[PDB]
Amino acid sequence: GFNVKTPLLATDVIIRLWDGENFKGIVLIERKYPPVGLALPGGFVEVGERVEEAAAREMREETGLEVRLHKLMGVYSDPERDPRAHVVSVVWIGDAQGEPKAGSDAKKVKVYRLEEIPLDKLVFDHKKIILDFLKGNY
Amino acid sequence: GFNVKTPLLATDVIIRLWDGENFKGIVLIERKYPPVGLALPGGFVEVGERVEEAAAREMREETGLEVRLHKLMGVYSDPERDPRAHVVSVVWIGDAQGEPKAGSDAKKVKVYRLEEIPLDKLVFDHKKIILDFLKGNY
């Protein structure tokens, strides 16, 4: 077959949650598996699946939300960002209405005001990603 | 050994070539190996390597240019974009000065004015990518 190996591909989303025209903040997850801690919702892209499809799918599974992707925010690939293996993440910014419901790799799902995100409890490199988001560094 | 399979990760660059304040167009590659045709310079991302580093390495290797990445332009993941395997590409827009030159006769370098690119000769989904660039769809 094709004998080429590359980092694993995953996708995460910065979900801006809304209750009508009222901004509530973003949705973060309490990881249920190995890298335990607070983080953005996201998952691995399946072979044969478009990155945007994996993001929507991954959001349904973990947050129960129907997320409309708004913008490609960035691609994070520092070798040591994911303890499980070398994982490169395509990060999106999206929007959603409704009530979050945990599931899958997520043992807990919750909304955080952008001014109330406990940056130091974030796992992976999500603190850097979120800081980039808050600063408009994209 | 982390039994997770995802698409392969690659990165390509749209190189705006300059001769001083004079814009010359884009740097493309004429592939001799399948897919045979015109293509953006780029390659697979290696495990343990950052995407920006893979792009920089591929540019020096394929065009012999010292390219300064300028903008994350997009991520392309259509399942059929690459015939070899499901490959997802992180596309950047960069700039370079100087004269390019192939690192192998299998990859001849050519500079094209944006108005004279033979879109019909582009392989992979690079026609889609180049048009997105020209239309500013990013």
The DSSP annotation for B1-66 comes to -------EEEEEEEEEEEETTEEEEEEEEEESSSSPEEE-SEEEPPTT--HHHHHHHHHHHHH---
Instruction: Give contacts of B51 with chain A, Cβ < 8 Å.
Output: 75, 77, 88
In units of Å, what resolution does this entry have? 1.8
Give the Cα-Cα-Cα angle B11, A57, A66 (nearest 5 degrees): 120
For B1-138, CATH gives 3.90.79.10
φ, ψ of residue B100 to 5 degrees: the values are -80, 170
Cβ contact, residue pair A72, B74, below 8 Å: yes
B23 vs B96: CA distance, rounded Å:
10
A47: nearest CB among B46, B86, B138: B86
B79 vs A6: CA distance, rounded Å:
17
User: Hey, what amino acid is at A102?
Assistant: A
Residue B68 CA: distances (Å) to CA of A136, B62, B94, B132: 21, 15, 5, 20
Q: B26 and B112 in contact (C-beta within 8 Å)?
A: yes
Residue A87: CB atoms within 10 Å: 22
Coil, helix or strand at residue B114 = helix
- Name the helix (H) or strand (E) containing A60: helix A51-63
Experiment used for this model: X-ray
Q: A11 and A43 in contact (C-beta within 8 Å)?
A: yes
Question: Domains of chain A: which residue ranges?
Answer: 1-138
- Which residue from B77, B78, B97 is spatially nearest to B89, judged by alpha carbons? B77
Cβ contact, residue pair B6, A85, below 8 Å: no
Cis bond before residue B35 (omega within 30° of 0): yes
- Provide the β-strand partners of residue B107: B31
A132 vs A87: CA distance, rounded Å:
19
Query: Chain B residues within 8 A (CB-CB) of chain A?
Result: 2, 4-10, 44-52, 72, 74-75, 77-79, 84-86, 88, 90, 138
- Name the helix (H) or strand (E) containing A3: none
